[PDB]
Symmetry: C2
Subunit: 277 residues, 2 copies
Amino acid sequence: SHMTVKYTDAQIQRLREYGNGTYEQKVFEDLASRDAAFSKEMSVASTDNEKKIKGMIANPSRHGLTQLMNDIADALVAEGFIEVRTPIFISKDALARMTITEDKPLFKQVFWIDEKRALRPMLAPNLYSVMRDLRDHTDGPVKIFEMGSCFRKESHSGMHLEEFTMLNLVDMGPRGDATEVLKNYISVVMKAAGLPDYDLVQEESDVYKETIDVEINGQEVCSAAVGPHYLDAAHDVHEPWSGAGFGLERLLTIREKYSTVKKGGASISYLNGAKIN
Amino acid sequence: HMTVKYTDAQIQRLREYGNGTYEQKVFEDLASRDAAFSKEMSVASTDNEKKIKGMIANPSRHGLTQLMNDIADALVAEGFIEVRTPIFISKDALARMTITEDKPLFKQVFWIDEKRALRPMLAPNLYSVMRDLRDHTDGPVKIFEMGSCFRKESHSGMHLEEFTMLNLVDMGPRGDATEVLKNYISVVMKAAGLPDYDLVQEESDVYKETIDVEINGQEVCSAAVGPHYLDAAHDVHEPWSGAGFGLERLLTIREKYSTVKKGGASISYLNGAKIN
């Protein structure tokens, strides 16, 4: 049959712990060749991992996630966006205003702090407030963005990451062609993240006026949309707007070719793609 | 003669949209006070809206984020690794810090479930990271992290429940521990735009020595020189020096904001200006 045997599922997990190669593409003739190559790639993975750690101690740099955030934010500031920073705590009434109530499945993913406050699962509740407040101070476009941790329970959503860093940009204000405005903003982020080549998926929407999803090799990377949305009235928003949400850990993982999504972000086991324990 | 000041309520009204020094003002009589009150209230509201429109005309990075970048670039150039650790920490990790059900620091902890909580401090994760990096080098282990920490306000005397902490540490310096610690303090304060500060060294029975940094009588930094009696519980058996900074407080003092709620994360304030 020829080129039949791949790495086993257990072999893949062992290789990915310290290594960042693409081991799921290797094919082999028989079990002996697989085990021989597995032994060699495990040794290379562990040795390459040790070299990278010593390279960081010898020549430290900014954290890869913090570097990713600075590169995108500077590009968005240069595009006229205001960087805002909102608290991680949001109120139960803010969640309810987002239709985040019970028997709605997202409610079970929410980390509750007390009876009245919770960890934000998304940046939309606070961004809604800042959008409306800035409309009172200008009649031109309201262009804001925030990068910050969001929290969702793993055992109700998958997602693999309970804490994840989101980037959400918003351009509130009527546009002659909000789609081109959206695609230009996505291009600004994707080039600044170091991922200039990607795929766009444009579909008409039920709740929004138009959605735009960004793909890289079939992987979901960004979900954008053109307003209005049926939740705009609940937040005293009554004008067109376009926005885009980016998972920054997911962007960093794809750019740096990390084998899992838990290596580039916040961790006590990993540091910039290398396992320190 | 003049013994009339703004009332505490009037001070709160002025500090709502203004960043002036209102608690310093004395007036000859009550009519001169309330006339100056409307003057400063109108000036504060006028200048506050100018700043908002000025930021829409020329956007920039957030004041806190820009401060983090200025300090982090300076520490990286000094040889520090920037690490980022999860906000969630385990109850066992807090117990290793002797943050158990008996101490009042326990009552500040925001609990997530039965075994996890929001970090009230960066030390537990930095204990783990610095010790794991010692396995990979024979020289000094130098790391720092800036991130949100959480403490309940009722038991804390804090006025921020979410605050951005900067913690740097040098495990096994070369290198006199107290001397290298003052160098790192100077690097952070210079990069933060606060070069003039008061540094006092105190003795200790839990650390080898403590160091506190103040600007005009307000604590700005609390540093210490290990070893500490918690180090063996985290498998650390070598001298170290570390410093902790409250970044919102640093930004508030430099920009001369009237409250500590104007420079950090907020839905009411943006870079010192009230947007609602």
